[PDB]
Amino acid sequence: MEGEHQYLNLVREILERGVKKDDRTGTGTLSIFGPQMRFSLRDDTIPVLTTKKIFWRGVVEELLWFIRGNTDAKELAKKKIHIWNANGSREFLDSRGLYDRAEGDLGPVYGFQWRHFGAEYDTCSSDYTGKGIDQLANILKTLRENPDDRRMIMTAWNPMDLHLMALPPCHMTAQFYVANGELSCQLYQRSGDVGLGVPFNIASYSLLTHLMASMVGLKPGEFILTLGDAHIYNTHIEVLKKQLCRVPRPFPKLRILMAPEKIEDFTIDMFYLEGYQPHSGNLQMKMAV
């Protein structure tokens, strides 16, 4: 009942006890409230699902993009990452009342808040160096100097910047914790697409915990995802029932070849997955409009 079984058990529970709940978009969900998953990062483990192939290059390039404080979707499209193109399109910015916003300029989403909380937003190409509160740098410093501190919070939930964002954050608040020279991270995610998004999010914050651990001379401990509204979309049900038949294989290991002086200078070449052995191909379409 550890590891990937955590995720599979969450899928069953939503399928068996979920509540029907039309939703934001034209399509329905089965939904529960408040479920939690815990993943061991010990022995270099990283919880990348084996019952479904995860787009690992996508996870890495998006996280490095967050860590840099970047908000331009075009930067991800250049590395053939398409996950933010929809929400940064002329149509979608216009539907959000952001008419004077250049295509691919998502506003002060995630990374911007991580590295520049409270800074005035101009455009995604502006220079934000030394502007706002650098929550991530502050946490890294606290992990070196005072690891027992109970206020190591990094949030993207800034009520004043929500109207400027293409989308309000999902993975909204992370807390860090140290015991026995092990770094743990809890993520509060207000809303989780359990089929498509959550497996991505688990890989994202697990990697972040690994990377942050290597920056401050600590071993990785646990990643804990706590969800608000965890839902499966009605379209994903039959696909997920198939995924549940698959026997999980051991989780891959993360190898880190080096850690740079500044966390924002990490590149995909500095680390890789060793032993990632996922199963066959199966799709899950995401719905909006």
Q: Taking CB within 5 to 8 Å according to partner kind, which of ligand MTX, ligand UMP, a copy of itself, none is near residue 89?
A: none
Tell me whether residue 29 or residue 45 sits nearer to ligand UMP (CB atom): 29
Taking CB under 6 A as the criterion, which residues in 111-170 touch ligand UMP?
150-151, 168, 170
Neighbouring-strand partners of residue 206? none
Give the residue among 284, 280, 282, 273 at the shortest CA–CA distance from 48.
Answer: 273
CA 115 to CA 263: how far, in whole Å? 11
Interaction of residue 55 with ligand MTX, rule CB under 6 A: yes
Interaction of residue 83 with ligand MTX, rule CB under 6 A: yes
Strand 19-22 to 28-33 pairing: antiparallel
End-to-end CA distance of the chain: 38
Exactly one of 193, 232, 243, 276 binds ligand MTX (CB under 6 A); that residue is 193
Examine the residue annotation and report whether 170 is marked as an active-site residue of this protein: yes
Exactly one of 10, 48, 136, 172 binds a copy of itself (CB under 8 A); that residue is 172
Of the listed pieces 85-93, 97-105, 194-202, 208-216, which binds ligand UMP according to CB under 6 A? 194-202
Interface map 80-119 toward a copy of itself (x if CB under 8 A): -------------------------------------xx-
Q: How far is CA 29 from the centre of its chain?
A: 21
- Confirm whether residue 43 is marked as ligand binding: no
CA 204 to CA 109: how far, in whole Å? 16
Q: How far is the CB of 238 from a copy of itself (least distance, A)?
A: 23
Q: How many residues bind ligand MTX (CB under 6 A)?
A: 13
Tell me whether residue 135 or residue 206 sits nearer to a copy of itself (CB atom): 135
Taking CB under 8 A as the criterion, which residues in 31-50 touch a copy of itself?
31, 33-34, 36, 38
Contacts of 146 by beta carbon, 8 Å cutoff, 6+ apart: none
Residues that bind ligand UMP (CB under 6 A): 24, 150-151, 168, 170-171, 191-193, 197-198, 201
Which residues define the annotated binding site?
24, 150-151, 170, 190-191, 193, 201, 231, 233
Residues that bind ligand MTX (CB under 6 A): 55, 58, 81-83, 167, 193, 196-197, 200-201, 286-287
Catalytic positions are 170
Which residues define the annotated binding site for dUMP?
24, 150-151, 170, 190-191, 193, 201, 231, 233
Residues that bind a copy of itself (CB under 8 A): 19, 21-24, 31, 33-34, 36, 38, 117-118, 133, 135, 148-151, 153, 155, 157, 159-160, 168, 172-173, 175, 177, 179-180, 184, 186, 188, 190-191, 222, 224, 226, 228-229
